[PDB]
Amino acid sequence: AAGFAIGIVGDAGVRGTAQQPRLFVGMILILIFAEVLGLYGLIVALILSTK
Amino acid sequence: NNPEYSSFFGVMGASSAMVFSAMGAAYGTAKSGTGIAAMSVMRPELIMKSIIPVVMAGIIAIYGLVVAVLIANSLTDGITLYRSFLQLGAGLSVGLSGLAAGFAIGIVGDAGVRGTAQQPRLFVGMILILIFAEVLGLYGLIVALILSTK
Amino acid sequence: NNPEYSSFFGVMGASSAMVFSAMGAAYGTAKSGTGIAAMSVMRPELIMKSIIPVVMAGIIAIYGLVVAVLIANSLTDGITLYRSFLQLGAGLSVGLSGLAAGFAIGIVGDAGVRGTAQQPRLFVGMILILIFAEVLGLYGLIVALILSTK
Amino acid sequence: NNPEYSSFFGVMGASSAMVFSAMGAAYGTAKSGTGIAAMSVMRPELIMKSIIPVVMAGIIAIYGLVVAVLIANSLTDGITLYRSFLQLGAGLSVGLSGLAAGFAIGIVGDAGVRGTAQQPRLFVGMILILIFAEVLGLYGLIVALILSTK
Amino acid sequence: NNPEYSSFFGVMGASSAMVFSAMGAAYGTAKSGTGIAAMSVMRPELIMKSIIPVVMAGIIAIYGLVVAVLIANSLTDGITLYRSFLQLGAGLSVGLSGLAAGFAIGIVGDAGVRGTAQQPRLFVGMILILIFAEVLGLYGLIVALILSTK
Amino acid sequence: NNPEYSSFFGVMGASSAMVFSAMGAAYGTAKSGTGIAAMSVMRPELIMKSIIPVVMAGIIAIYGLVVAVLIANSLTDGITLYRSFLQLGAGLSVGLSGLAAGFAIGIVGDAGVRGTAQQPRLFVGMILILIFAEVLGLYGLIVALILSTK
Amino acid sequence: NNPEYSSFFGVMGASSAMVFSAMGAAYGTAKSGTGIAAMSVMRPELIMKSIIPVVMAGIIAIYGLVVAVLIANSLTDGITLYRSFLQLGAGLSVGLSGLAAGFAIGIVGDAGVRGTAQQPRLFVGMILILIFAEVLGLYGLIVALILSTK
Amino acid sequence: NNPEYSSFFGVMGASSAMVFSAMGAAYGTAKSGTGIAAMSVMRPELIMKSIIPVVMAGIIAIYGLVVAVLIANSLTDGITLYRSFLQLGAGLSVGLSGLAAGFAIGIVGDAGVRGTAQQPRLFVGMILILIFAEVLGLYGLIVALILSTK
Amino acid sequence: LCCGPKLAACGIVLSAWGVIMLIMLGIFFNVHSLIEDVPFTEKDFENGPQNIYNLYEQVSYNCFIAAGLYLLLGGFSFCQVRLN
Amino acid sequence: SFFPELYFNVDNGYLEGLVRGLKAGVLSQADYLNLVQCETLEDLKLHLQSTDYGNFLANEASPLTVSVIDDKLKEKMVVEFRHMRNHAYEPLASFLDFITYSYMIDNVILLITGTLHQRSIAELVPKCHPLGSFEQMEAVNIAQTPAELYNAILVDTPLAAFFQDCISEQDLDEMNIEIIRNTLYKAYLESFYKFCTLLGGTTADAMCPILEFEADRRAFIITINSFGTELSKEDRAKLFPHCGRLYPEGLAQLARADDYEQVKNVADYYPEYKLLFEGAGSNPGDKTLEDRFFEHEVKLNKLAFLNQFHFGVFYAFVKLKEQECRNIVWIAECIAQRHRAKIDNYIPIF
Amino acid sequence: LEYSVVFNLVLWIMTGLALAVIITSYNIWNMDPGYDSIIYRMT
Amino acid sequence: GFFSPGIWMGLLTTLFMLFIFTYGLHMILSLKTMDRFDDR
Amino acid sequence: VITFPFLFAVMFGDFGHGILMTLFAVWMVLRESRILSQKNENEMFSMVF
Amino acid sequence: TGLELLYLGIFVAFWACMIVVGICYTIFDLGFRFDVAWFLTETSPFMWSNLGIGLAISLSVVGAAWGIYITGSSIIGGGVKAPRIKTKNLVSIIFCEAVAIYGIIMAIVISNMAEPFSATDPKAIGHRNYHAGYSMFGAGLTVGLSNLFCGVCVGIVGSGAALADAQNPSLFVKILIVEIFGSAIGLFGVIVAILQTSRVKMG
Amino acid sequence: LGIIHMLFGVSLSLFNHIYFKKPLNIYFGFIPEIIFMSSLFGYLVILIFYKWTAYDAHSSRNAPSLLIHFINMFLFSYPESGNAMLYSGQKGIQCFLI
Amino acid sequence: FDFGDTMVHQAIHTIEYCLGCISNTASYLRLWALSLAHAQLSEVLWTMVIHIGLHVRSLAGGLGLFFIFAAFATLTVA
């Protein structure tokens, strides 16, 4: 799920940034939340696999 | 006295709670991100306001994270099966409900942000609509908690 | 004397009610929000009236929350199975009926909201039509309430 | 002496009667509202008359409510299976019949509302064709009711 | 003695014959009727000639009727099963073969009517083709009768 | 000495042979007739020559009829199963091979009929190719005849 | 000590060898004939020396015929199963391999004939390429011949 | 001591090897022939050299032929089961790997030949790339050979 | 040959890194005659610890041989950059 | 196939009935004869009022001129089209958009040239063909800057994809305006044809023959008209659509041809076309090739109305009514200029 | 014992859930960004 | 065993009504609104 | 200045690569005068410099 | 084509699994584990009977209802310019209501035969009850599907009739003949369903 | 490392709020924020070091699992048995801190 | 003084702070996640490449190790 999120926003973000460099900060924030989704997956796996 | 395989149900719940809600948040974030890019190039001054759909999307994923942990910390080998079924249902309830919320958040975010680019007065209405999608996610959390502790 | 695994069906009911109702409300919300963003960009003065479709969608979601909780509070371990089938019926009845209501709300909301800006006299007709969709969601609740206590 | 699971088939009849009828009415309403929204912009004076397709769609939902409740009030624990399948048949009979009728009402109503605005002499023809659609849903109810006591 | 359930296959045979032949006749008729109406607007004087394809389609229906009646009259409770399989095969043989014929009848009739509308000399040609399609249906009947009396 | 239901496999052979071959001939006829109807408008004098693909297709149908009858005549109740499988194989071999041949007849006739009208010298080439399609059907008949008597 | 289900595997081998090979040859024939018909418009002098792709297609059908006969002649009642699986493998090997070749023959034939029409120098090349596809089909025969006698 | 059906997996290996490898070569051949035909109109010179992708495709088929024979020669009735599974693996490994190689050969050859017509310097690059795909096919053979003798 | 000074320069860096790594590795094998513990021992292992020492000595020798080739490579690549 | 005749009437049922009801209103051969027997423009108006036409010249200038009736006829069918276009759903609306694209293409050719020769957009828009519309901005108020128009088109205008052949602006300045528009239209035909084949039911079989004709008809006329001008044979070939019957082999001959005789020899391989070149006597007082092509195109568009479950009825409708307008204007013009012997040069539409 | 119960449950539960993931993944995989605004220029 | 008379009969009836649901939902999903409104 | 390189070293805690990484930086600094007082059209090299 | 891809993927996997299981049960020589008689006899005839009853009526309504919208849209559309249409072409919808009625009558005649068994062990119990059960299922299915496709036929033809009449009022009468053939298709399904249950008994 | 570094980042906010003389940002902001983070996450850090020095292999069986106690801490989950406590009175401390 | 907006803004701060503390603490699992990955990529590059450069054959080992190391060095950097 996170891979989908990162890819889709990356494409739009990279293209937009060239159009408007001010997009850099917004792109970073969006990418973070998408990565967090991958992190949440790890968190559950760590708790479950050790239970 | 405990039927083996019983844990399978609860275990799938803990995973499902995270996986389905993650897909919802992933859709919401990805769909909003495209709309944000369109707005920002037209006008970057709103870049710090159009992010909100994304934050909301994340909260949905958290709803799922909370249940997934509650289920995982409620697993045992000597499971009575009844509780395992409740855990599966609770995990699916929040996961699939958050999934629906994720689509709701993404679709309205993209439309709202793109519209807001042209009409700043649209912001308040966008937020109210986003509120309903977050509420849709919460309802799932509420039921999941009721079932998992039942 | 009670069959094993009998709780499964009732648990699926509680989750089904919430999930399908959230799916319905989510669809109705997303479709209305798109129409609202497309409509109110030209006529922001309608932004506080075009929200109603979305509120009604939220009611579909509540129907689901009420039954999903009613079912969950009705479950135990030693369920006679009979009761579980009744709980499953009540869950699906409201859930899938709310889902159908969600589509009615969504399609009529989008069409009505954009049309209303083109013709303000349409507003009342839009609400009346959306009222039938809320009634369709309620019929599901009525049956679910009858079954869940049967 | 009661084949276990005997109650399962019956309760699904009540569910089908309501869910399928709601789906039909929901579609019927969605199509009618869309046609009304498009028509009403140019000829708002027809808004009140144009609502009829929506009411009939609603009636389809009622037929389903009638059977779904009749079955629900007819459920017990010691169901002899014979009775259960009769209730399932009645549920499906009205469900699919109402579902098909809802489609006819929606599709015909949409065209009828648009045509009427262009040529008011078609209004009566619209009503006549739509009555037939409802009569089909009625048929579904009549047989579904007859079967419930056989 | 005569095993139970043995009639099951024979019943499916009688049903298969009629249903698949009805499918063929219904398609072939609908296709011809469309072509007939399409032509008749342009020139009505050929309407009578364009009817035959519809009769062709009806014959497909009869092919199915002959076997379905033959089997249905032959069906009893104490069937030696072997007989049921012959009936099953005969039912499918005529139904599916008539189905193929009905499809062919539809395609060639529709194209033939449009062709004749443009070129009256085509009349004999399309009739010869339709004769082949009727022969294709008869072959189905022949095999079905041979099996049904075997 | 023989197992039950042993005729089941054989009787499906007789049915399969006729149905698949009829489906093949039906397709080949339908495609050929379409080309004939479209072509004949410009070149009516070719109507009595462009029918040939249709005759070819009819041969595929006979191929199938011959085997279906042979299986039916050799299908008995006290069948040794071995022979039943052989009959099923023979039925499928000719039927499915005829189906493939009917496809080729169809495509080649459709293109060939139009190509001939645009090019009188193609007539011989069209026949040669359609001869190959008839040969493809015959190969199926040969194998079926070998199997049904083995 | 022989398992009866053994003859089924065997006879399905003979059937597969013929059916799939006919499908391949039929496809190659259908595509080659289509290209030839179009080609003939401009270059009718090439019609006779453009049939080759179709002959090759036929050779694929023969590959199958030969194996199907060899198996059919080998089929007996007391089959040791081992032989049956060899017959099944040999049947599929030649049939499906010929099927693959049929596509190569068809696609290359169509493109080759259409190209040859404009570039006569392509003809040797078309043949070399199609020779490779016939060789691919032969490979299937080689394996089938090895298996059928093992 | 081993199951009488244990030989099934091996012969499926020998068949799968040939069928998938031939399918790969057939696809690669068809794709190359299409590109070659188009290139040949642009310029004669390259027709001869452009055959190479087709030869490489053929090698893929041989890879499969080698394994299919090795399995067929080693497959016996009193098979060790272990060896049979290995043969199934070896068959699939070379067949499916060659199949993947066939697509690479096909797509690269088509694009390469079409490009080379415009830029003759591409010819060397085209061969080098096709070499990697042939090497990928060899890899499948290597594993199949290891499993076949293991 | 020139080959391009950009590629000769890369060779110098690879050669220098290699000589450093190969000498140090060979020493480690000779001293701990060890962490790597991969000298390709025999499967027919007898009660002779001295057999393990001898294996490492062989590995060490091989390491210095590889270093010698890198010394030759560095020499050649060096002169290429100076001449380029 | 079973693709249509089932879901088709769910959304497109109304439009099919309406558009065929509109077709019923086209002037018949009996009606054209009644219009010929006028010899006065006011009498022409009076006789038109006997049909679905009429009462649209009311409240206009007392004297009736040809230019007025021409504009009004266009407007009538534009309204009917826009009505059907507005009451439609994506499955069908996309088809109609292609029809509008053909007119948008002509209009953007008008927007350029004028931009290239400093003219304001506001001055150009009033002379754009209806259905172009261009409700989007950025194409408006370009400040007579070619780059701004080429950016607005690339981004907002649906024709953006088609311009992929003609790009970078350099093409706009260096290519002749006519090569640019012919190139763009070819791209349109290629996409539209493929779209019709994606709708692989009755529409594809009923519609494609019409598009295939247009492709071949333009190839023929382009080859002939190009003889007397300066145009590289290769650049001419670049303008031939590949969705037609000449594409396999035939266009190669037209691309090489330098004479009408060679073009006919190409037609000789296609009896459907050969008849048109033989019928086009081209005598000094006879019909020409363009006239026979119009008659053929109408035959094809009329045959489209023999299928009751497709989108090709809407395309044929527009073209037949457009020819209807040409026919009516022709009659009005022949009356005004008193050339009564040339009145029977209209294209009958049955 | 009661295999048919565990079997029936697990089969359809994992099948429905697996499909829900497949369909959801499909819908996300093919998310339509709009292919407008800046995409026309970047293409 | 893999299936019981209860389980199986349930699945058989479930599929029939599932097909009905699928049919209904199919047509509901393939339901569009207008791109634009006709006029003022 | 300290926090970020430290967190990197935690993520990249490999002695052998630390040497390679250090030597690269030293090389760039030792050639600082020659690299800076030159043209460097490749932004990737300029960035790491 | 997202839904078509879903339907195909399920179709292929569904039958692909059946092929593997079928061939495996054979190969591994299972003790007739796949027992068709078991399936047919354990499934209560009440399921088969009541399913046929619901299908007989419900499928017929689906057909009727399908055809109604086919001709409804065409009639309403054409009527925009030809208001005369509603006078005559309403019979197409009369035909569709008639197609539904066919199923309704048949469904009731079948349901009138429904009876309890008071049966337990299928072995040698209710032999005739199983025949009646299967026959009722077949007859119900027979008429249901036959009316289902009948309704579609008459709908499509009625559409052509409305489009013809819109342009020429003389065409309606001649075209009407085709719909009559369509209606006959449904009646044939009724005749067979009656025969199939002509000799059944429950209880 | 993460938690300690985070606490540093919070500590810096105090100096900024002092510089701009925003008593409210420290009386209602910094103080409850740093306590919140300390009470949840600094507690965890202490326990991690405690375990390393508190338990040896002599108690490897039924050795407390820090992750489980952390989750049970937040939820006020104190089973009678199944998990050994890290130290006496921990239950009171865990409840207080949350 | 917009009391409503101030309350909303402060509420957002608290919500993000508390939820961020939970997520931020987990975020530093990046330190472990990458440190693990690096060690594993290094181990496999060693084991599956340079190990091959060692052999019981003297001359073959020396010459091969040269070429194998060069590949190891190349992959180590890349």
From Swiss-Prot, chain A:
Keywords linked to the UniProt accession: Cytoplasmic vesicle, Hydrogen ion transport, Ion transport, Membrane, Synapse, Transmembrane, Transmembrane helix, Transport, Ubl conjugation
Ion transport as UniProt keyword: yes
List the Cytoplasmic topological domains: 11-27
GO MF annotations in UniProt: proton-transporting ATPase activity, rotational mechanism; ubiquitin protein ligase binding
Tissue-level expression reads: Expressed in brain (at protein level).
Spans traversing the lipid bilayer: 28-48
Q: Name one GO biological process term.
A: synaptic vesicle lumen acidification
Q: Which residues does the UniProt site feature Essential for proton translocation point to?
A: E35
GO annotation, cellular component aspect: clathrin-coated vesicle membrane; membrane; proton-transporting V-type ATPase complex; synaptic vesicle; synaptic vesicle membrane; vacuolar proton-transporting V-type ATPase, V0 domain
| Lumenal side stretches | 49-51
Q: How is it modified after translation?
A: Ubiquitinated by RNF182, leading to its degradation via the ubiquitin-proteasome pathway.
Report the superkingdom from the record: Eukaryota
Localized where? Answer: Cytoplasmic vesicle, Clathrin-coated vesicle membrane; Cytoplasmic vesicle, Secretory vesicle, Synaptic vesicle membrane
* Lipid biosynthesis is among the record's keywords: no
> What is this protein's function per UniProt?
Proton-conducting pore forming subunit of the V0 complex of vacuolar(H+)-ATPase (V-ATPase), a multisubunit enzyme composed of a peripheral complex (V1) that hydrolyzes ATP and a membrane integral complex (V0) that translocates protons. V-ATPase is responsible for acidifying and maintaining the pH of intracellular compartments and in some cell types, is targeted to the plasma membrane, where it is responsible for acidifying the extracellular environment.
Q: Which family does it belong to?
A: Belongs to the V-ATPase proteolipid subunit family.
Swiss-Prot record, chain K:
Q: What cystine linkages occur within this chain?
A: none
Annotated TM spans: 3-23
Q: Which residues lie on this side of the membrane: Cytoplasmic?
A: 24-43
Any idea what this protein is called? Renin receptor cytoplasmic fragment
Say which residues of the entire protein are included here.
Answer: 301 to 343 of 350
From Swiss-Prot, chain L:
Tissue localization of expression is:
Expressed in brain (at protein level).
Entry's transmembrane regions: 1-21
Question: For side Cytoplasmic, which residue ranges?
Answer: 22-40
Where in or outside the cell it occurs: the entry states:
Endoplasmic reticulum membrane; Endoplasmic reticulum-Golgi intermediate compartment membrane; Cytoplasmic vesicle, Secretory vesicle, Synaptic vesicle membrane; Cytoplasmic vesicle, Clathrin-coated vesicle membrane
Q: How is it modified after translation?
A: N-glycosylated.
Would you say which domain of life the source belongs to?
Eukaryota
According to its UniProt entry, what is the function of this protein? Accessory subunit of the proton-transporting vacuolar (V)-ATPase protein pump, which is required for luminal acidification of secretory vesicles. Guides the V-type ATPase into specialized subcellular compartments, such as neuroendocrine regulated secretory vesicles or the ruffled border of the osteoclast, thereby regulating its activity. Involved in membrane trafficking and Ca(2+)-dependent membrane fusion. May play a role in the assembly of the V-type ATPase complex.
Subunit field text: Accessory component of the multisubunit proton-transporting vacuolar (V)-ATPase protein pump. Interacts (via N-terminus) with ATP6AP2 (via N-terminus). Interacts with RNASEK. Interacts with TMEM106B (via C-terminus).
Q: Could you say which protein family the record assigns here?
A: Belongs to the vacuolar ATPase subunit S1 family.
The identity of this protein, by name, is V-type proton ATPase subunit S1
> Gene behind this chain?
Atp6ap1
Task: State the covered range within the intact protein.
Answer: 413 to 452 of 463
UniProtKB/Swiss-Prot annotation, chain M:
Q: In which compartments does the protein localize?
A: Cytoplasmic vesicle, Clathrin-coated vesicle membrane; Cytoplasmic vesicle, Secretory vesicle, Synaptic vesicle membrane; Melanosome
Q: Vacuolar compartment: which residues?
A: 13-14
Highest taxon of the source? Eukaryota
Signal peptide extent:
none
Segments on the Cytoplasmic side according to the record's topology features: 32-46
TM segment ranges:
1-12, 15-31
| The protein's role, per its UniProt record | Subunit of the V0 complex of vacuolar(H+)-ATPase (V-ATPase), a multisubunit enzyme composed of a peripheral complex (V1) that hydrolyzes ATP and a membrane integral complex (V0) that translocates protons. V-ATPase is responsible for the acidification of various organelles, such as lysosomes, endosomes, the trans-Golgi network, and secretory granules, including synaptic vesicles. In certain cell types, can be exported to the plasma membrane, where it is involved in the acidification of the extracellular environment. Required for assembly and activity of the vacuolar ATPase.
State the similarity comment: Belongs to the V-ATPase 116 kDa subunit family.
Q: What is this protein called?
A: V-type proton ATPase 116 kDa subunit a 1
Full protein segment contained here: 396 to 444 of 838
